[PDB]
CSV table of C-alpha atoms and ligand atoms in Angstrom, one decimal:
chain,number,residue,atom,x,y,z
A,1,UNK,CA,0.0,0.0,0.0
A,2,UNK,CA,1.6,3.5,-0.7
A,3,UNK,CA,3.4,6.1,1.4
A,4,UNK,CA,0.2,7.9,0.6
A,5,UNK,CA,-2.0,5.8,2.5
A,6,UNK,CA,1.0,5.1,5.2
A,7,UNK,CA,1.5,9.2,5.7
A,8,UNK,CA,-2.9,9.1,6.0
A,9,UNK,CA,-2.3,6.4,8.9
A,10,UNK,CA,0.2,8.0,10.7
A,11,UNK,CA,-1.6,11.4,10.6
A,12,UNK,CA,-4.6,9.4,12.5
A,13,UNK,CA,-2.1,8.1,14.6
A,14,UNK,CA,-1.3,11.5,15.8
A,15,UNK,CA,-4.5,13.1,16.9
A,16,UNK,CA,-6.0,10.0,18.1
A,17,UNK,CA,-7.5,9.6,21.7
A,18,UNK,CA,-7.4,6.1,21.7
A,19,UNK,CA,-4.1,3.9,22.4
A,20,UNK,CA,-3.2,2.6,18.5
A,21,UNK,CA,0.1,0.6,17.1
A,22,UNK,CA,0.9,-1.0,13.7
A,23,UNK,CA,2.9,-3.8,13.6
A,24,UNK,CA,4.5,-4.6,9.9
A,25,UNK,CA,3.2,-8.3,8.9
A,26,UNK,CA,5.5,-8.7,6.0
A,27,UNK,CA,8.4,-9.3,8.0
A,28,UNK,CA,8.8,-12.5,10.7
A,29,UNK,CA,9.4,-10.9,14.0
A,30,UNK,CA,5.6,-8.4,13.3
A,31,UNK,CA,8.0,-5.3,14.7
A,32,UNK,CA,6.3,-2.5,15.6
A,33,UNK,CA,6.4,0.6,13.1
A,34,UNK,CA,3.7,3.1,14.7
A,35,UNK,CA,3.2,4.3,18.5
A,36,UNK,CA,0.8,7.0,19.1
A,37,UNK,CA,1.1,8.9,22.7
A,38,UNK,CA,-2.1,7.4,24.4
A,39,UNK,CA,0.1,4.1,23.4
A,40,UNK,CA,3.2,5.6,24.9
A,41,UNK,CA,1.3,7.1,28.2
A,42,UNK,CA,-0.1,4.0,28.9
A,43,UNK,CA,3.0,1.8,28.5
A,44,UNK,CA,5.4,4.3,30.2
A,45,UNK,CA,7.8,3.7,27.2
A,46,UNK,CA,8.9,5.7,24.7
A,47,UNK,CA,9.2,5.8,20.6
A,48,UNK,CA,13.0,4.8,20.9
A,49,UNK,CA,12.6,1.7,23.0
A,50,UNK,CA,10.1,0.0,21.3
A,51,UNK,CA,9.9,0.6,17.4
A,52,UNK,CA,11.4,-2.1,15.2
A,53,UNK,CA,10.5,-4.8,18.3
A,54,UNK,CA,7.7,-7.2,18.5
A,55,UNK,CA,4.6,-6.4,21.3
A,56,UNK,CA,5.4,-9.3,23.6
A,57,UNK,CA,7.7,-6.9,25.7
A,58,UNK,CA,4.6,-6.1,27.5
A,59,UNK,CA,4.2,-9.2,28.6
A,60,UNK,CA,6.3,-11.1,31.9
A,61,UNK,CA,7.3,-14.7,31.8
A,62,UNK,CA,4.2,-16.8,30.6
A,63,UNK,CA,1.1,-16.2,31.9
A,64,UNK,CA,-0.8,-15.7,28.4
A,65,UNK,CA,-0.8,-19.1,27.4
A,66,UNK,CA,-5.0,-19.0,25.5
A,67,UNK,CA,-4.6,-15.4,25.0
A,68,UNK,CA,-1.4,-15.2,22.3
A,69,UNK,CA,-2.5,-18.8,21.3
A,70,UNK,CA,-5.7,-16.5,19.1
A,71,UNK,CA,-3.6,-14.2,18.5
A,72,UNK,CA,-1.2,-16.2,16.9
A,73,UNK,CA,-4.3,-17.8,15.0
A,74,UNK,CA,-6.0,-14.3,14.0
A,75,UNK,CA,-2.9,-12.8,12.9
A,76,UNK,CA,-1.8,-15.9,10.5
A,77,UNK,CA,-5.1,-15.6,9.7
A,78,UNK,CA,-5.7,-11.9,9.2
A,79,UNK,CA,-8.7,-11.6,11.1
A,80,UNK,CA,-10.0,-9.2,13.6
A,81,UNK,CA,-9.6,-10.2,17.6
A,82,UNK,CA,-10.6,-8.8,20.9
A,83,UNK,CA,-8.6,-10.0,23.7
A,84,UNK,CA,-7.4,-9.6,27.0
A,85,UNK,CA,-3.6,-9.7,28.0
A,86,UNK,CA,-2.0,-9.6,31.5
A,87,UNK,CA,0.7,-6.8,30.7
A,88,UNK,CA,3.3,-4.8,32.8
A,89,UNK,CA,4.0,-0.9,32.3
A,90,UNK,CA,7.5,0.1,32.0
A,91,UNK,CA,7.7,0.4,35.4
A,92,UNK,CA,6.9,-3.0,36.0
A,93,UNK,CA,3.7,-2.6,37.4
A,94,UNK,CA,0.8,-5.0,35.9
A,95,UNK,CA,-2.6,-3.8,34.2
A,96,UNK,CA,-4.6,-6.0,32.7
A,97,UNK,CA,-5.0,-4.7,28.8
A,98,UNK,CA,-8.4,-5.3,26.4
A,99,UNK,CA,-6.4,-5.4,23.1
A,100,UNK,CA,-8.1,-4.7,19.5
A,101,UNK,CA,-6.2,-6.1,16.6
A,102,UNK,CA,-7.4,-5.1,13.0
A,103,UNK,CA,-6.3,-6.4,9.6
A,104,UNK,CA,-5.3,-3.2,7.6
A,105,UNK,CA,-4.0,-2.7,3.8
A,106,UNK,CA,-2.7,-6.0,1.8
A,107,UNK,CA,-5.2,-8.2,0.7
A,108,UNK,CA,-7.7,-11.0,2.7
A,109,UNK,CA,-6.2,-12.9,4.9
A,110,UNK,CA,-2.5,-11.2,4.4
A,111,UNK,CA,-2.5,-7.5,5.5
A,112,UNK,CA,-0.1,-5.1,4.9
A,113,UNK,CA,-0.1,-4.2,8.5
A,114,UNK,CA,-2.0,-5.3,11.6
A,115,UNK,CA,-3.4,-2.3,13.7
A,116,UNK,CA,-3.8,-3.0,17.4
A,117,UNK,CA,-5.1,-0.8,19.8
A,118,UNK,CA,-4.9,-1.1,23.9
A,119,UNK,CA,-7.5,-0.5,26.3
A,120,UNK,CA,-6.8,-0.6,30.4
A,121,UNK,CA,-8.8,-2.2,32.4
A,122,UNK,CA,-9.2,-1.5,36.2
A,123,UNK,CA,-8.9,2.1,35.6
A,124,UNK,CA,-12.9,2.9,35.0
A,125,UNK,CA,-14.2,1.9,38.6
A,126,UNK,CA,-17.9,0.3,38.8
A,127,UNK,CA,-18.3,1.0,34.2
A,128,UNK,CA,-15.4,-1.1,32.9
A,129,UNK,CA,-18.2,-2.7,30.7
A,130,UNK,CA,-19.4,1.1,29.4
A,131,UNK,CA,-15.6,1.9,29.3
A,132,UNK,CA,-14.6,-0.8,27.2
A,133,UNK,CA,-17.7,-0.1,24.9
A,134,UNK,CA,-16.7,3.7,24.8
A,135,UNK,CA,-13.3,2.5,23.8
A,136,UNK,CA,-14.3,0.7,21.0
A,137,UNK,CA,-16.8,3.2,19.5
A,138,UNK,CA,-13.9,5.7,19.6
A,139,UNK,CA,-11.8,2.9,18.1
A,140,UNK,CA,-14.4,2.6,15.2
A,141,UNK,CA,-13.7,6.4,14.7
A,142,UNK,CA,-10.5,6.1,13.9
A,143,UNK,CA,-10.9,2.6,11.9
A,144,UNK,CA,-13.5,4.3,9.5
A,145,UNK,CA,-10.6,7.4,9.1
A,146,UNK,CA,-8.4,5.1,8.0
A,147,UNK,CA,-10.4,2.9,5.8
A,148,UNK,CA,-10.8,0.3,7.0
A,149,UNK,CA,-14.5,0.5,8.3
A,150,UNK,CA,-16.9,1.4,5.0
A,151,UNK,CA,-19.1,4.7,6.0
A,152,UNK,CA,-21.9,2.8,5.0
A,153,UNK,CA,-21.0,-0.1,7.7
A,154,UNK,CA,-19.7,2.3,10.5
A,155,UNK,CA,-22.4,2.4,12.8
A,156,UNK,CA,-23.1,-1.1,12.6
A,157,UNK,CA,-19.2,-2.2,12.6
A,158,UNK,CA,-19.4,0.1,16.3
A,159,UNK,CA,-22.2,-1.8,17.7
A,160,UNK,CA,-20.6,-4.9,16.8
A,161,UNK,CA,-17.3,-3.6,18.0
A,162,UNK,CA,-18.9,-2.2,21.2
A,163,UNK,CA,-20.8,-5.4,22.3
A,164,UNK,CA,-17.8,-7.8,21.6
A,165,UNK,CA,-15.6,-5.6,24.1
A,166,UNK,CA,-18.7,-5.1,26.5
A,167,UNK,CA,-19.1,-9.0,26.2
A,168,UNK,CA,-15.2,-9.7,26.7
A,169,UNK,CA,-15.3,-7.3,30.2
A,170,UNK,CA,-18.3,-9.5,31.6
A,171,UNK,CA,-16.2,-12.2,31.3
A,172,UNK,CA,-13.4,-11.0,32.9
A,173,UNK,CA,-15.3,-9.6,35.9
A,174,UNK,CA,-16.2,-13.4,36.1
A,175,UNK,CA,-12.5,-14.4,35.9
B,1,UNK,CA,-16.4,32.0,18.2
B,2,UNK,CA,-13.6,32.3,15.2
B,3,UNK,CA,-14.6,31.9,11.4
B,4,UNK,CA,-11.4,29.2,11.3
B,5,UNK,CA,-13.2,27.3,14.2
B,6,UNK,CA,-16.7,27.5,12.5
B,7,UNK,CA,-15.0,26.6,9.6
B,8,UNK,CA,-13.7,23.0,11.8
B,9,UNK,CA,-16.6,22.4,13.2
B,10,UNK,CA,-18.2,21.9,10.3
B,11,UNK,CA,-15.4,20.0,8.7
B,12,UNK,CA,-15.7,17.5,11.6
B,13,UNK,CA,-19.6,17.2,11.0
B,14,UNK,CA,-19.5,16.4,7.3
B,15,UNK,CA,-17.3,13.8,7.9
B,16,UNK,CA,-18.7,12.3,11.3
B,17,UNK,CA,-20.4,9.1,11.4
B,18,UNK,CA,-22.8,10.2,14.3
B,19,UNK,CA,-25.3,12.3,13.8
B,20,UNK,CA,-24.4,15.7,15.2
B,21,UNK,CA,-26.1,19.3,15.3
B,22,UNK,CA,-25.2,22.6,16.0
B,23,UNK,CA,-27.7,25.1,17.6
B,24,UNK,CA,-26.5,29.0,17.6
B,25,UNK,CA,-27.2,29.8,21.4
B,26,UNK,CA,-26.9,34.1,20.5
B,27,UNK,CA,-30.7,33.9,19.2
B,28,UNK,CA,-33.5,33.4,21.6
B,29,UNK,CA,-35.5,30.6,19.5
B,30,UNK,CA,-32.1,28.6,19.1
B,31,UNK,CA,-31.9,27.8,15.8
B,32,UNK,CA,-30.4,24.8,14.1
B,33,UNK,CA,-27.3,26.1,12.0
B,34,UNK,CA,-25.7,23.0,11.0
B,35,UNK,CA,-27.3,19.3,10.4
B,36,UNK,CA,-24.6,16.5,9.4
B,37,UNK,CA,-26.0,13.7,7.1
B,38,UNK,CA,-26.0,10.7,9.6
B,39,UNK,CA,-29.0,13.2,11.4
B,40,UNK,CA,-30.6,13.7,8.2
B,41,UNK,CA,-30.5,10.2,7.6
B,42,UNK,CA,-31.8,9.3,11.1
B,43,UNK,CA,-34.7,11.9,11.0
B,44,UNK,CA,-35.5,11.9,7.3
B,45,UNK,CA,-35.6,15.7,6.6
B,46,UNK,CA,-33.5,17.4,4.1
B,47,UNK,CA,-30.9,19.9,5.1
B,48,UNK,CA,-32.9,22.7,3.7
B,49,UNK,CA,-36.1,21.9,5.5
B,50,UNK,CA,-34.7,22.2,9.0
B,51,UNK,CA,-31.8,24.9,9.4
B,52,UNK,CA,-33.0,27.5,10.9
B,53,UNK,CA,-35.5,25.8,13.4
B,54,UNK,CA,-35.6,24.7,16.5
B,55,UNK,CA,-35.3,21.3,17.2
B,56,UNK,CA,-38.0,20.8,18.5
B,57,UNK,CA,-40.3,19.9,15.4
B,58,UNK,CA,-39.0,16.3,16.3
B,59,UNK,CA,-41.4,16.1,19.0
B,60,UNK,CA,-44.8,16.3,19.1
B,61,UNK,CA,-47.4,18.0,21.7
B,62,UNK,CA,-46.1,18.5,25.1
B,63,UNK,CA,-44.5,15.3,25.3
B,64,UNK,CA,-41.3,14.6,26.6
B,65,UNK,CA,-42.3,17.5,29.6
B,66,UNK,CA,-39.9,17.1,32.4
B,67,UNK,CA,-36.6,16.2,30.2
B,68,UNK,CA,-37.5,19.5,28.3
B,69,UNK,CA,-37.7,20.7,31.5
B,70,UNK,CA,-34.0,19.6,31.7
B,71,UNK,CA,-32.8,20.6,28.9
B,72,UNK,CA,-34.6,24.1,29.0
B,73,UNK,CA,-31.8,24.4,32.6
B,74,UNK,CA,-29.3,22.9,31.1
B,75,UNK,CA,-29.1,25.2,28.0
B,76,UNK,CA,-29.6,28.2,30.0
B,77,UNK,CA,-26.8,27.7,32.6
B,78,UNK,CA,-24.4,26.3,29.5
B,79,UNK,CA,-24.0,22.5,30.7
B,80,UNK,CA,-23.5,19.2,29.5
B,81,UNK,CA,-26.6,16.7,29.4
B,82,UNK,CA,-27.7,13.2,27.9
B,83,UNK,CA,-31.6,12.9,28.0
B,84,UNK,CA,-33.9,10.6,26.1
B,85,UNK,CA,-36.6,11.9,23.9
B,86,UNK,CA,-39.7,10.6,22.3
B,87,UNK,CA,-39.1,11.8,18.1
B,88,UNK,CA,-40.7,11.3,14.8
B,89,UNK,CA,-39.3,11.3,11.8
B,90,UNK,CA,-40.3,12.8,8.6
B,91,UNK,CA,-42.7,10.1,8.3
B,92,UNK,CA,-43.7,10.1,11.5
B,93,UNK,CA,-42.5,7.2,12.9
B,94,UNK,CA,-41.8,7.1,16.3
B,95,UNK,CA,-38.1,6.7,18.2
B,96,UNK,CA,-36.2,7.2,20.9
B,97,UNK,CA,-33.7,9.5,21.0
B,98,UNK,CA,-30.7,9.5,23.5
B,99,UNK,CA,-29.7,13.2,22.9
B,100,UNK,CA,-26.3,14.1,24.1
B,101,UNK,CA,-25.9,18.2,24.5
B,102,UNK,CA,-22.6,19.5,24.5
B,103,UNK,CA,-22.0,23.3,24.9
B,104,UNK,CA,-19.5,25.0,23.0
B,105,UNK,CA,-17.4,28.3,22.7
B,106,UNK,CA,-18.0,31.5,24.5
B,107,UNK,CA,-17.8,31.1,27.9
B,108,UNK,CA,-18.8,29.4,31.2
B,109,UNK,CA,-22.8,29.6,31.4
B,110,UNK,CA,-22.8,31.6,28.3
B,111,UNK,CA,-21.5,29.4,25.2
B,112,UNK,CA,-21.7,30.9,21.7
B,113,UNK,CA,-23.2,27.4,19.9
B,114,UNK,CA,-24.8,23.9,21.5
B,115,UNK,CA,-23.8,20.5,19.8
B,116,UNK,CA,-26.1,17.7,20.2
B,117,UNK,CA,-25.7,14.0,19.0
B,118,UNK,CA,-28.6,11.8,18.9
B,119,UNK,CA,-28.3,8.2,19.3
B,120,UNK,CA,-31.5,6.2,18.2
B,121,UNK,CA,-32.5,3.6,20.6
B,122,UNK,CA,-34.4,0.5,19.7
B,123,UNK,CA,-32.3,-0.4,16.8
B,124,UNK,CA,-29.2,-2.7,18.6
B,125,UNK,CA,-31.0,-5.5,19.9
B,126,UNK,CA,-29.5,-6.7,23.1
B,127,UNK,CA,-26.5,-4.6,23.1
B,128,UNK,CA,-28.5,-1.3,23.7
B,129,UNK,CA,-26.0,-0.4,26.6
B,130,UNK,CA,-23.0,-1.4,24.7
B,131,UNK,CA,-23.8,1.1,21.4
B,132,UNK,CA,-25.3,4.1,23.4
B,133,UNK,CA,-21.4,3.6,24.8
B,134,UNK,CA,-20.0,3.1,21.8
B,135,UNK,CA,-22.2,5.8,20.4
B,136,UNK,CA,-20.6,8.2,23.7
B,137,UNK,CA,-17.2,6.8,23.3
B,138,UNK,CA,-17.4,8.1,18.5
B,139,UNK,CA,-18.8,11.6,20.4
B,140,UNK,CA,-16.0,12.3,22.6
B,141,UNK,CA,-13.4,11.6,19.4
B,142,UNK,CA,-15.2,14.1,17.6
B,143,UNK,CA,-15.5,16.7,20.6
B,144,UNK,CA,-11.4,16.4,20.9
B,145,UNK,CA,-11.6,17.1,17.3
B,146,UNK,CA,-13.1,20.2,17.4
B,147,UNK,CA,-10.9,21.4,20.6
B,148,UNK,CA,-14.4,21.1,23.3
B,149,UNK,CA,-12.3,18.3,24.8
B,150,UNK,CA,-8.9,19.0,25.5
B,151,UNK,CA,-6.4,16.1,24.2
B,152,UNK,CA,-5.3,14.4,27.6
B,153,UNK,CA,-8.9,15.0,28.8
B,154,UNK,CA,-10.5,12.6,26.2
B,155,UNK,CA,-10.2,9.4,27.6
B,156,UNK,CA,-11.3,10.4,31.2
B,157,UNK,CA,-14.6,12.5,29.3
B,158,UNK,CA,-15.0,9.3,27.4
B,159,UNK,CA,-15.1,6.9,30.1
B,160,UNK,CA,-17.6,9.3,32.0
B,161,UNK,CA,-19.8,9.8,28.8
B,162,UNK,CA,-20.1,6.3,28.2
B,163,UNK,CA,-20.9,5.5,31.7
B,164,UNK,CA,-23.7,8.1,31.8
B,165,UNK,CA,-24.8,6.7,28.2
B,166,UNK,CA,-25.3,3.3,29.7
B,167,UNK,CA,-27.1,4.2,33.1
B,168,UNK,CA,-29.6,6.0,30.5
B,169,UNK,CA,-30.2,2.9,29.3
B,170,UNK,CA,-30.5,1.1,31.7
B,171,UNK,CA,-33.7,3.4,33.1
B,172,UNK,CA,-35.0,3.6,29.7
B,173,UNK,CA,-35.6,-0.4,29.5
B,174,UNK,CA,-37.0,-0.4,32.2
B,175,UNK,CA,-40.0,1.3,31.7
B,176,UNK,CA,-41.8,-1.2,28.9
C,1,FMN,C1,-0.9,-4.9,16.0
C,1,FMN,C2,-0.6,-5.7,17.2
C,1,FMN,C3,-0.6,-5.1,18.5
C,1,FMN,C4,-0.3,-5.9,19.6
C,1,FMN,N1,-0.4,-5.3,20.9
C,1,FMN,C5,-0.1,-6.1,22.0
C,1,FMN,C6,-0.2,-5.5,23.3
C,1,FMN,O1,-0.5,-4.3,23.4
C,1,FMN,N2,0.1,-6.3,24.4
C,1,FMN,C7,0.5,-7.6,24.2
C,1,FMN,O2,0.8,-8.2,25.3
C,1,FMN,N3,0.6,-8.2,23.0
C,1,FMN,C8,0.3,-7.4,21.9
C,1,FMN,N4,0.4,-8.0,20.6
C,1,FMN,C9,0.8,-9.4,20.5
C,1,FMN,C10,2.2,-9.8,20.2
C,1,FMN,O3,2.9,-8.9,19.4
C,1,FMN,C11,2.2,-11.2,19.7
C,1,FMN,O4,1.8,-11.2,18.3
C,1,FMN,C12,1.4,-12.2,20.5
C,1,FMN,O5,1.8,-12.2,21.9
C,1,FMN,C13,1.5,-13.6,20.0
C,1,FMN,O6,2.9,-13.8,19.9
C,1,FMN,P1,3.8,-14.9,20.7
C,1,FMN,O7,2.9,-15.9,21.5
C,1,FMN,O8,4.5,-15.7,19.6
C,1,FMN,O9,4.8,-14.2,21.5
C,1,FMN,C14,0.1,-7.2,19.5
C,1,FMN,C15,0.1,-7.8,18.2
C,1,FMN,C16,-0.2,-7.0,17.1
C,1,FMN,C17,-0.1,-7.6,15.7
C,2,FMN,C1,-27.9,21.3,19.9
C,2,FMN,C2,-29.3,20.9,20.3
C,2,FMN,C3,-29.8,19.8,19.7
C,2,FMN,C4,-31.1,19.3,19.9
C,2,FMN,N1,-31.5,18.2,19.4
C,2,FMN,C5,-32.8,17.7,19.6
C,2,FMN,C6,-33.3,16.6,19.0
C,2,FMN,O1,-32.6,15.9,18.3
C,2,FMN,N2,-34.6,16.2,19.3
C,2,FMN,C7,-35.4,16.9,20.1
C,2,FMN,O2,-36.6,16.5,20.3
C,2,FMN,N3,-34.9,18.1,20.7
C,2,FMN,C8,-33.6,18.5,20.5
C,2,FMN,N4,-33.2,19.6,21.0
C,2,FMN,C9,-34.1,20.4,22.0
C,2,FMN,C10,-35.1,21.4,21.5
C,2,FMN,O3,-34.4,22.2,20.5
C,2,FMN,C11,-35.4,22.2,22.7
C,2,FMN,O4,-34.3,22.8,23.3
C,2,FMN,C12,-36.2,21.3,23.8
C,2,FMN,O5,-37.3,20.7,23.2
C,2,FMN,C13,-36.6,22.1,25.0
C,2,FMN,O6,-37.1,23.4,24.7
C,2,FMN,P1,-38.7,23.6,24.6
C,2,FMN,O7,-39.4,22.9,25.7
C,2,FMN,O8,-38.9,25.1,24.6
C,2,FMN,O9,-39.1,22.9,23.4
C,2,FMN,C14,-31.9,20.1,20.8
C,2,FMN,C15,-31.4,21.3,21.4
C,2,FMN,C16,-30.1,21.7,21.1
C,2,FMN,C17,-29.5,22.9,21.7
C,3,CL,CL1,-12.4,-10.9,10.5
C,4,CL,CL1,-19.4,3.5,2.1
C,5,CL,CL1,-29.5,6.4,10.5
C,6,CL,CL1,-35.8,20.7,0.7
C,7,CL,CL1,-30.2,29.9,11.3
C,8,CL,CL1,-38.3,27.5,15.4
C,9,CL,CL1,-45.6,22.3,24.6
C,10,CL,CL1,-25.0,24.0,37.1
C,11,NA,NA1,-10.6,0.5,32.9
């Protein structure tokens, strides 16, 4: 896909409220090539550390063993996936983390780029469920800038999106 | 408010995919000065019919009393409010309306415009909590667009706007 639509991505990337990384899917390791600032606020990191690595460094030891097993799956596969990851801040300290991925550019099955963007749980009180939702309509927003959510499809594409995130929190509360 | 920020504003509305309005709050009857096409398309009235009313021709009667009531306070003392509202569209057919007022420019208990965003109820099934959320969560992006939300802000007014969203909800189904 061109520098065209890359520069377009990155621009959304910028002003973004939400959390949003690309990872490059053409190459092995899936290294990271865009970090907005919500991305960087969250993780405590910053753009030197991380672009050009792959986004397990959030993670410690093993303790995502189902989680990474879908991912793994939707990204060979080049579908979308809402999960949730136990992940650390630079710092060390742990937050759990309701993670978007979305195919972007390339073809079916074999983007260009995955996009991925991070919610935190724990930090919404009594509404994680609204929260999550919130994120994800926001999220939408910024798919449907991009491209990758038709206009005609965007308000259903957030419904969807919202209720598969408000679904995953329930679950979680029930962990 | 600034011809460049007018100018935004309405950049941010054609391109939205909620419904928004803009109401200029310097006239008395409060008309309608811009209507994006995700309203029209929700109401069913052309641009042209509506700019320059009130919004009001989406009710009917003296219905929706006390969260006029509301809105009448909240538009006078220049503050933030989600309220649902019996509509019609051009066809009369009946909806819900969560309507999400935002005020904008000027200053504190006197802002130049009002935003509002409507988000149709009765049209996601069982995941009415989780779109009216989603619906809050779209709104807030487009509020930091325009500069009503400032950029660190966002994600705190989100989370709060999708929370009040939801409890809206919540009372609303629970009527019949
Ligand atoms: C776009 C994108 C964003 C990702 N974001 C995160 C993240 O925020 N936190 C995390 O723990 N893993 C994230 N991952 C997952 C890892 O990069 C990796 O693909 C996953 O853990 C499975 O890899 P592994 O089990 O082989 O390590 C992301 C992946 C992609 C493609
Ligand atoms: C920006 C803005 C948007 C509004 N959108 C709607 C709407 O979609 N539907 C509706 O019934 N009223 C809407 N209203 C409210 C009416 O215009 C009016 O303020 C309300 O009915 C209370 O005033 P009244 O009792 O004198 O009619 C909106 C008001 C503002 C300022
Ligand atoms: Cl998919
Ligand atoms: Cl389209
Ligand atoms: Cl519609
Ligand atoms: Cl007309
Ligand atoms: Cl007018
Ligand atoms: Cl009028
Ligand atoms: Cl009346
Ligand atoms: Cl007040
Ligand atoms: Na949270």
């Amino acid at each position: 896909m061109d520098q065209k639509q890359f520069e377009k991505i990155r621009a959304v990337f910028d002003r973004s409220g939400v959390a949003l990384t690309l990872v490059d899917m053409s190459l092995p390791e899936q290294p990271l090539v865009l970090a907005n600032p919500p991305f960087l606020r969250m993780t405590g990191y910053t753009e030197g550390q991380i672009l050009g690595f792959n986004c397990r460094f959030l993670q410690r030891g093993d303790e995502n063993a189902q989680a990474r097993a879908d991912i793994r799956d939707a990204l060979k596969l080049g579908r979308e996936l809402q999960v949730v990851l136990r992940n650390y801040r630079a710092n060390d300290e742990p937050f759990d983390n309701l993670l978007f991925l979305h195919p972007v550019g390339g073809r079916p099955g074999a983007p260009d780029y995955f996009l991925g963007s991070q919610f935190e749980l724990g930090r919404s009180g009594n509404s994680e469920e609204a929260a999550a939702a919130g994120h994800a309509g926001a999220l939408t927003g910024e798919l449907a800038r991009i491209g990758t959510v038709a206009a005609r499809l965007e308000m259903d594409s957030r419904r969807h999106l919202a209720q598969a995130a408000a679904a995953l929190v329930r679950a979680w509360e029930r962990r």
